[PDB]
Design a protein around this nucleic acid. Sequence first.
DNA 1: CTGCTTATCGGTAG
DNA 2: CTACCGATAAGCAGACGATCCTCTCGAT
RNA 3: AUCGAGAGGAUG
Lengths: 154, 196, 215, 56, 119, 196, 56
Amino acid sequence: LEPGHAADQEQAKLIRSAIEHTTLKSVTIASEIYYDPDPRSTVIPEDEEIIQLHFSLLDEQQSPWLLRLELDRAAMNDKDLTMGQVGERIKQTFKNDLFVIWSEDNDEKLIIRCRVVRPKEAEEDHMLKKIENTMLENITLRGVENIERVVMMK
Amino acid sequence: KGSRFISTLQVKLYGREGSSARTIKATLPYIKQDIPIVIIFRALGIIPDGEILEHICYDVNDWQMLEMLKPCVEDGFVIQDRETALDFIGRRGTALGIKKEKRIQYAKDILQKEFLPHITQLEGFESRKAFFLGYMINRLLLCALDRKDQDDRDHFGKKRLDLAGPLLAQLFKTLFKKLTKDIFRYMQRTVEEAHD
Amino acid sequence: MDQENERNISRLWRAFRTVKEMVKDRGYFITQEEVELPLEDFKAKYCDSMGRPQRKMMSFQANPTEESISKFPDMGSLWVEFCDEPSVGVKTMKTFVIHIQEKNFQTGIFVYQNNITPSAMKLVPSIPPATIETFNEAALVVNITHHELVPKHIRLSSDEKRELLKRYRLKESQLPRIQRADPVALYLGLKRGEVVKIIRKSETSGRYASYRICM
Amino acid sequence: LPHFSKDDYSPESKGFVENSYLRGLTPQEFFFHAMGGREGLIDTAVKTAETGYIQR
Amino acid sequence: TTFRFCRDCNNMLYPREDKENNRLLFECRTCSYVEEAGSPLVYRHELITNIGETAGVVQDIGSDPTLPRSDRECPKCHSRENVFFQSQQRRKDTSMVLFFVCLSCSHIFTSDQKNKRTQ
Amino acid sequence: VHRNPARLMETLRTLRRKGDINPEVSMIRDIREKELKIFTDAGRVYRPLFIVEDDESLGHKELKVRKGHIAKLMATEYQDIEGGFEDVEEYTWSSLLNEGLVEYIDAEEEESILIAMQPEDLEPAEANEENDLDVDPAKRIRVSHHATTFTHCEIHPSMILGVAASIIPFPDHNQSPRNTYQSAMGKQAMGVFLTN
Amino acid sequence: DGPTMREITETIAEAKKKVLDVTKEAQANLLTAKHGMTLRESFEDNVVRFLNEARD
DNA sequence: CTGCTTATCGGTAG
DNA sequence: CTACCGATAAGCAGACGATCCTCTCGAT
RNA sequence: AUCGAGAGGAUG
Ligand SMILES: [Zn+2]
Ligand SMILES: [Zn+2]
């Protein structure tokens, strides 16, 4: 640690969680594809209001195929993470070529929804799989590559 | 009781965890490259998808198993027929075009002898070797999903001891056949002579 | 992201500092007042009317200390420039060389932010007598000589070196050697032949001195 | 060993010799201490050929 | 997931979008057959999987001698007869929970006091 | 495949224990994998041992060989000592192997059984003893039987040893590598190597 | 000593019991994993130390 | 449980 | 919006493997 | 006498 600090553990904890490598992969229960056509009205009953507050009518497309992402309420406690910070590092990756929604930490079910966008060989589907692939092993959330389990020894 | 024909077969699983598309192939005796499994089954006697999967997966409930096999099928839509299911298994020579109907009869007996020489080695057996080749696959995957352990190599029940008997055997057998072809080579040199 | 606009600037500030420490360490002239410039006074003075950090506004020449001439009548004129442009092709290379070529300097340091295209590295050493050097921001946020396992190195002169070669009766080859691309040897900027001297500490005899020739 | 049930991570099952050299080992204990001591002879047999190549 | 097969030919089915009325159709690249979809669910990966944990359970398990026998009770019947074992799913990061098998009745229960379970 | 190996297994094991199916040949029922492997290969290593069975009527779960069997076994080894003038001679080892009291177990089949260690102290009843008064302070501490659904039982543990090793007095009071040394030296000691 | 021999076996018995609880715990999923290692890794490390400290 | 060779990937110039 | 160069990631191959000592046996 | 194999001794 910096000479300015010494036995301030709270300092060290920060540094721990600013260094340790964390991939989207390490926080994923299950990835899945769906045919959701009506953008405003989703076919899934688990996501009523998301989807109910987003407040997209402040401006104010489209995309056919959807890709869901269940997250583990478990590793949102150990590694320091919020839904938002996740979503942002996602969009920040592709840029302005895919819509991305999500819920709040307060909710019981943590979820992500994504939809390709928007050029102008159909077969649009196979590739969408190589986005959910790139999405897992290649997406950094916080910290430096090559680093793994980081220990707080005195 | 058929000498010592050590004809070794391996079923491999290409690509690592999280790779693009993990395809399954196999090593066959007297053949250059590896061969997608779906081609092997068609080259046996089973043609349609979904019937192929019934030799491999046994419980049509547990999907992940099934979802493992999409890559293979989608690799075999190029060969759908009995006949040329063995056309792909014909890279033995550099365009043995002279054998368009003979390379098949080269492949046809290769799955009589070199492919699982136990079980049987006669003609009228194909569903015997399919259920097995399709049981190696149930194992190779029943492990890649991590539902059962890898196989231990230093287990004492999976090794034998070549005693004085069978030692002499694999010797005497080799001796006798040497002397047997010392007779032939002597006979071609009679009549020729009488002889006696 | 309003913090990633706040760290990007802070990292640029330590890199700025480290460039200073190096320039004076080659033998040039900078006050310890100019280096220890707090984060305040830098938040403005080097940005625009909103808070975006202007690099072209940092560039500066450099003159040697009156003591450096006594040992090097050659060292005289150094110039540093920073750059806003991430990707730098053969087009950006044309601009900087022409700057010095006419100004009649000798040393050109160019600090970029991301990386250089091989179409630009091709036209680097082909314009003597002067010479140009290059460094990644990310490799200058921290000064490397400011680290334990690193001892201090001291470039010694030509008429000087001949003295080592006579008083240990060596041949050029016979010295130990240091790498051109070597972190330190870049921090000072060596040459084909220039010899260092190294004053490391020792559990055997307090101070021990090793010498290295360059490759 | 086939003298145990499956899924048993207790001391005695996984090779802790309670008894001392004086009181005497028990059958399983004996056999475990066997697997152990063996590792000694194994190393000195085949590891030295490295510790001696290093020296050279 | 559960994907499906065609009749007649009998191969695999590959998805397709209905351009006009917006719906989902499967079909084989052999004959032509095309059936409508059931659930929107087309693909599923799972990285952390709750199944595989409890395999090989039969009606002939309360006979194997190599399996340990505890003093639990079945929350349905009440027989202190049962056999048990850890997660058959031989992964590295798995849990050490027990899975017991009611013998007088035939039921399956666990020692995990936390974490909800659906079997 | 077979449906209902409940009875099919038991019928196989009944005929070998009579001697009808060669006592060499081994038979491995797998509950939790739904498999049944029968082996006849040459080279498998095997050993004794005793049999146990709750098939006993008014006496819980017990060993098969009773004290009466032991008597007919020494009334043979003494019979051919003094009055050996042909007085109706019989009852050897192989007599046991046929009356079904010993089973030749190989390593693979060793996976499905729960062997006891000490015949007597491994199924008598409760007391219990452990921490209960009183015992001999100077004797050793034994695991204790805690699982009771045994099937077999070991002959005598000293039998884990080899020819050179069984020369060592109290090998269970020595540090292991030592007993290995004596094994190599016992073969380099000196004496009578043959009476001739 | 007879008084000592007793005390030794009783200093193995409260350390073979301190292991039964660390199993009894881990088996009802209450055993929290140390940052950066498996749940089975922190059980293993745990027990092994419980038995070494027991001998010394 | 490797330094060296063979192969397919992006960069600026005809 | 295409061929020529060049520079790197990817994949088959190598040449090593303790010291000294005593004996016996079979061979062109 | 030369080539080839195997066993043993000292560091455990
Ligand atoms: Zn069809
Ligand atoms: Zn019950």
